[PDB]
Design a binder for this molecule. Sequence first.
Ligand SMILES: [Ca+2]
Ligand SMILES: [Ca+2]
Ligand SMILES: [Ca+2]
Ligand SMILES: [Ca+2]
Ligand SMILES: [Ca+2]
Ligand SMILES: [Ca+2]
Ligand SMILES: [Cl-]
Ligand SMILES: [Cl-]
Ligand SMILES: [Cl-]
Ligand SMILES: [Cl-]
Ligand SMILES: [Cl-]
Ligand SMILES: [Cl-]
Lengths: 329, 329, 329, 329, 329, 329
Amino acid sequence: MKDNPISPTIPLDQDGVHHGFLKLPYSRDDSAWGSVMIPITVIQNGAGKTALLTGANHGDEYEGPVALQELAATTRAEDVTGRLIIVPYFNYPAFRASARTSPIDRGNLNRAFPGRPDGTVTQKIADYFQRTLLPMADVAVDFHSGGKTLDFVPFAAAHILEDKVLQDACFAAMQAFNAPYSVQLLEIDSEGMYDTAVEEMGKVLVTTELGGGGMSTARSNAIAKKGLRNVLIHFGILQGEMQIDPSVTLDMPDGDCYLFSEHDGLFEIMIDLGEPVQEGDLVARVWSPDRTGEAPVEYRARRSGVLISRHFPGMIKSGDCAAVIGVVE
Amino acid sequence: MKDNPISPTIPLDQDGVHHGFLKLPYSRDDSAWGSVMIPITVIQNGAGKTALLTGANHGDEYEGPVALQELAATTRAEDVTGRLIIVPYFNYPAFRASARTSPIDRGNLNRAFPGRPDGTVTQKIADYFQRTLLPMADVAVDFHSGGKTLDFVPFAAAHILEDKVLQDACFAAMQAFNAPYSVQLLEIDSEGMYDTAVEEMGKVLVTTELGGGGMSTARSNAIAKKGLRNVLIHFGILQGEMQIDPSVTLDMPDGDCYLFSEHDGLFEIMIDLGEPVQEGDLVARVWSPDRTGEAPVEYRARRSGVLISRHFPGMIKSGDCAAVIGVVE
Amino acid sequence: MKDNPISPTIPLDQDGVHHGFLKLPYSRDDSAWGSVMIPITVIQNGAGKTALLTGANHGDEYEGPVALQELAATTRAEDVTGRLIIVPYFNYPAFRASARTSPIDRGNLNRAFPGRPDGTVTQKIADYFQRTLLPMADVAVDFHSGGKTLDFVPFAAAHILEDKVLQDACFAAMQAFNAPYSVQLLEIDSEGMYDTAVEEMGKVLVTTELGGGGMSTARSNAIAKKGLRNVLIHFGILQGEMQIDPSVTLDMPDGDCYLFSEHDGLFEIMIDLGEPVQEGDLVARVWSPDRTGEAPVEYRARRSGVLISRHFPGMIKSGDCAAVIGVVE
Amino acid sequence: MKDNPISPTIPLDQDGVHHGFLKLPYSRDDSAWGSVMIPITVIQNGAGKTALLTGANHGDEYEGPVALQELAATTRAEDVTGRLIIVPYFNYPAFRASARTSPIDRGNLNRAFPGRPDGTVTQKIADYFQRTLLPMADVAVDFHSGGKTLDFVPFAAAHILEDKVLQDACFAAMQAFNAPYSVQLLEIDSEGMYDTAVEEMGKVLVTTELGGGGMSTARSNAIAKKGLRNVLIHFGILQGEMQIDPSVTLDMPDGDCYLFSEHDGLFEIMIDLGEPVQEGDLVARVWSPDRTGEAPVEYRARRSGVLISRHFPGMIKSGDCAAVIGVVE
Amino acid sequence: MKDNPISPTIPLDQDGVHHGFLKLPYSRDDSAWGSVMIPITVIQNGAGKTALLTGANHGDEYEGPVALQELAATTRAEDVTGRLIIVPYFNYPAFRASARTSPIDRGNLNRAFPGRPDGTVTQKIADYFQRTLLPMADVAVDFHSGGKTLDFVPFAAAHILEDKVLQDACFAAMQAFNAPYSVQLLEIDSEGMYDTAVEEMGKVLVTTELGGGGMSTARSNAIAKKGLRNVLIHFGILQGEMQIDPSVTLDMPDGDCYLFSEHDGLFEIMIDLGEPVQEGDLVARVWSPDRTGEAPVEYRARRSGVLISRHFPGMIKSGDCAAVIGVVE
Amino acid sequence: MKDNPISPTIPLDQDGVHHGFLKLPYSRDDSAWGSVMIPITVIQNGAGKTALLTGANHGDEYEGPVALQELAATTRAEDVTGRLIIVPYFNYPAFRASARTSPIDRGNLNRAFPGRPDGTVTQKIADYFQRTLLPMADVAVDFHSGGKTLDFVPFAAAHILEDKVLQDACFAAMQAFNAPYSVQLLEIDSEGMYDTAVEEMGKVLVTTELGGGGMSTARSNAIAKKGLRNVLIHFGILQGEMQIDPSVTLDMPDGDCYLFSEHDGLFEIMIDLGEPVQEGDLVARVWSPDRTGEAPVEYRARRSGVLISRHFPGMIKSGDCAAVIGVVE
Ligand SMILES: [Ca+2]
Ligand SMILES: [Ca+2]
Ligand SMILES: [Ca+2]
Ligand SMILES: [Ca+2]
Ligand SMILES: [Ca+2]
Ligand SMILES: [Ca+2]
Ligand SMILES: [Cl-]
Ligand SMILES: [Cl-]
Ligand SMILES: [Cl-]
Ligand SMILES: [Cl-]
Ligand SMILES: [Cl-]
Ligand SMILES: [Cl-]
């Protein structure tokens, strides 16, 4: 396989604090000899694990990026035993466009793995992570949130894996994160995902869904920072005492959606995130976007639980997931 | 002045429940003989005031539209003493585009008054309301929310007016709405506004800011429905007992913004809506959108209070209002 | 009033055949020192009336432009007694974009009159015609067709005017055109129209609707050529014998539309142009564009007649005129 | 091969009338957890063939969709012996955009076969038809028309195939359709086509070209309905007597085009669809789109015949097929 | 007249060096409570004239902006006797888009005067300069270059004015600038121009054309810096000795263009900027953009001189000014 | 492999002068039966080499196209001994869009080789050149310039190749071209390039960089014409005496860039093309595009030399190559 064309502007394996870029050549109409300059910080000191920390895998998901920018700007080499490789804006082009996917190639980075060194920009990013960065990491933390179109109760997630020893390691790392909700689930759609790239190498992956709507709050930003610091202590890279608060564990959500809208319209949710519903209760109504006087279409809960995910925008489209009802363990 | 070209598909002054459209002729490349069909419901019965009820003055503001669609679809003529003229989607084209302003003319309907019958689509809407609908109304309720770029604590607002008798009437109607926050304020920018069109006629206007972010919640939707029902009881059009809960009154916010961003970047708010801050406390930080390792720009509270408004999206732009700190009476 | 900035590249009042442009200065991002070069041909010889002949008042209407390009390219000075001022592409920018309206300013040239010399490109075109060209003309012929969104039976039209002497002159010119259908109608929407600009000067105007759909046929192109040659003989500018065929006269259509769609969908017309319908007969059905199994919405004839106009495209929008039923005299 | 991700919202093999959707997951910036909901109706009763019926393979071709929506909405289970699988909008996204090709991926569905379950939306549609739906069908009817850029005399077509037994079966089905014109032709460009997908399985395919211009007429819509009903009787699925009218058979058109334009301009056709031309007769002229006085470019018939296809829009581009001359058998 | 809504973030009349913004409120879909933050620097010390210095009146013209950014960043209060008001990016939105005109309103700022406080963004900029900034200035320097579509020999220009005393003052200031070419000309198109706004107040205006093509060179940047420093010494605001080099004076160019292209194509200029041509010499040829083998269209010099302006891009459009031939005094 | 679908409208191997097109079928929404008509001229006479001559490999690079259009229009068969195959607009769609890459597929033709007959338009062009045209050529001349974003001193280039006999042949052809600068360099990025397609067949390739900025001058156009005529004499196809002027040879530039910008802003170059710099001298400064008063970012020469390449536009982006310093042999 050809070598990936990315070259860092900083060394990745030297002691100290280094701030620079992954330079990905990108020739196009408005820059014949141009590049995508992906921000990166490496902090390395003494002996320990290397953690690869990413935010904005999707460009409209902000909690991880806030936590990672602060981490990169405020952590001293002397506080670290091991290595932090910090990339707050993973699909950097998508992040710059405030979009889930890249405006260069419409690439969903989270489904681009293992990528290729001679493909689209998004594929070249994936390939560099697959073959260059991940092999130097022992563990990975990849932050997600709902994005502009979805909102979730704030959870950390661990995966059901064939390797039960790794599964337990991932579960322990997820507990350390200590988000207000905790999940362990089988990933239905594992092919091409970043999580799969990490896990199939035998490495612990920590992942989240920390809110959504294309925004973040002080509370959600604080969940990301605590969770990040906690897992970094768990991995032995940072030192100190972990913050431990109550967490609500959700029964195996099957990761699937059952309340798909069959109509475009004005979206009216009937309960808010985290709140209970009984089987048959109204979860949402879709009102006509183009006339008055018409009965709304109703979406009812198929079982009892709490609302764990919702369509975010005021307007919903045919085929959109309206809501997901989860079950507290 | 020429007559406005809008013609309703239903009568506006007949007893009963009528659902139809304001047909605004709109000739353009993709429809030579086309129209904007603005949904409208009229419900009239017995004797009483006429209320003109609008939502989606701005197209990305959803609480009012939910409350008004439900009102139009579920109210019986026999429940009404007076007249309801219900227009859930006021700048209908903006609403269809999920945008603050119309995609036809970039018109901000809320600053288009008094409009003109021979202008842009937005101006023709304004002119029809100014000269045809408002003169048949005794009172008006015009719902707002922050839109995609802003979020507010949920308030009902009444204006400081030169006519102190009307000012008191507006204040009383705002109290009846009974949102979780209550405001009375002088409008700095009154020229061209819908509120001014109503108030300068000597008529009570009820207005709100019920959340934002281009979405609504069951809680915010419920605030709109209760407030609407309450004011309609206050105006004698609907009957029943009002729902009265506690409300927090905000001292005269001067309606202005003091924490303008001077930088594009990643927006980190430090406290959430409704939460307290002391003078000099950090309210927000703007992180570099294109590198790591840089100290963030900080925005500090100029006085003590609670956060009443915030920039919503993850990314903030130079010149955006970051936040507004209000003071509890 | 300022002088219009248009300058012809040819003289407009010299004997012979001259082909050139109306140069309208147009400074913009992609040409700081640029122009719109509107094609024009002047043919002048001996003594007689001047006719001003325009096509593509709307840019997606093609019969007139075909007839006028052929006229400009094939008429000898020696065949003319008077003057032809031939502008096949009247809203030239709209014509170049294959659009009803200009892509520069969205201007509908047909409603831009009297225009202004310091306005938008479309307004400057109108102003030049209003103050420079029309005053040198005795008569005008302005070709229309339905455009991309409409189709009409092919008619020549004369207007009901306050000046009954001019009305009769216009009627006679319309009869000479001898399209397969003939109409005389009161124009409901006369303000700003080209037709009004001509007629209020006391001048004969010949106008048409010769088909539509953004295309033309050999038959429709031939209707335009015969009609043009006929009226030019009637006006004494060209010599020869007129072609006279049968014409169907339509009773005063009121120029208005009664079968507006209230739904977006798949458009199914039930009779074709020129064909009869009885009162209450189905004229069109609108099928759901996004599901199967739903009963279609039906549009029925309000009176007996023949179909004289129809919505053209497969997809119809809310507020589109579906069809117009006319009555044979 | 991976399973296709499409799941129907209805059963496809149960007796009765079922209306629903093929849910194709489609995650993108404006819907992270979204779908393309392709309308589908299944009608099954008793014993017989299964027919797979598609319209809007190309999204700007309307006759088939009208005929299929009516079929899905008006056919009773009790009228059927066999199964109808009805998909009026085959490239559903293209249909929603009124475009030949999908706005998601620019996919021409008619050249996307056999597709793949992990490709673009258009490829996933093709793959589902190739591996799931077609194998449950005995016969297929796939409607085409010219689209926005082309118009054809209305024909049903059967293909010259290597399997002469199937060729005869296809020919018989085409005769039953009984369009006003009949063709049997060798398909030059068979790779990737839907027709090839059906035929190479040993299955009868019925295909058409029923007009064009991005519109349909009552006559063309009626041709589609009769042809559909006729072939469904021929296949034994519906009962009744076929409608048989005269049909004109065209000699093997070689499916190729010889009158390509080498110029952009104003398109003037000289004869209309179905009308005769002699060898060397003028078929079309292209006039300058940007000046007057220039001789037009002429396109002449290479042999005698009738006009069977034409460029539709008023403006023609360099490299566009102007016209095709066919020969009556 | 209403007050302009712009408020500076810095004082404009205080001694010292102040860097900030003109905050122009700008509410729109992507920022409800947003602003255009126009950069501004004020440097004031001791006694003297105030100069108002602008670059990027057009956003794709770069020499002035380079010279003004350096001036604002490197000049000490102690070096100044008077006041510098420095706005390197005058049509700031156009500058941010690298466009001649604003992407907000397509406004050409140079023709927006006197503007209005309640108009478009561009008009509000003009109004603030007309009524607030210009009245506090004694002199103005407004830099231009050709932009993306034009290139000029580098000149400073002074205007022929009715006030001959001011005319002489402007001429003297232009000589001090000492560009490699010098011009004094009557402005044909004076209405709405910035230059007119300054001059009609009785104030000296210094203007330029320092190159073009949407770029600048070290030589052209150096012409701007020397010229700026020179005029600031001439006005008594900066101290030191002026740089004086040879300058070529051009005879009254009439500011008009005579070699307009009547064709789109590949543009071949035959002589370069500053080089001589004789009457009848070939100045440019336009080659067909869509075929080979065709004779090019030729543009010949109407009189002897030197090339002072040229169309820049490889592709030229109908109506573009190809070139202007000037005459050395 | 399938045959490429391109068919010439002229013979390619007949004596004489032939002007026509490569017809590449291209079906799309705005032309169902359309084509890309690539201009081509073939001139053949007597005995000799065939040269394949291309311009506008990138569509915004104009010197080659000017030289080749003139060559195709002015060369007589009788002047030729051999064959010229002249394609002035190689990526024809990119040329028509004045873009580096095709607007159809964003294809960079120069990296599309060997292409495929069933791929994108750009790939089909490449495939036709790879398998049809190149095999009939003995030599190739492929013109480049910087494009809209880059400017270069005008050089002819020859490559360092493994076949040292061919390397010497290429070097000799480059010397004959006799541009004002001469280079021989190892191509770092050879995979997929046109140059590689030619050279790996054992054939001499002549290539250039003759200026840039999306424009050309009489001087740069003249460099292209002389160089073309010279190499055609060297190859024995045209007769006459070569023009020989001084040429500056550049030491092996490594073809790489070391002064990448890490900042968006206003670009100020400090020396111009061809001018000397010493190690550590300032080559460029990037000024803030959104405020005043800030120190600029500086880019310094890493070694002594002359400026051989520069970023062209006024605005530079993060990751853009600012400049390249070369060394005179
Ligand atoms: Ca440790
Ligand atoms: Ca009452
Ligand atoms: Ca006569
Ligand atoms: Ca049967
Ligand atoms: Ca002084
Ligand atoms: Ca020879
Ligand atoms: Cl994903
Ligand atoms: Cl507002
Ligand atoms: Cl009109
Ligand atoms: Cl096809
Ligand atoms: Cl200007
Ligand atoms: Cl390249």
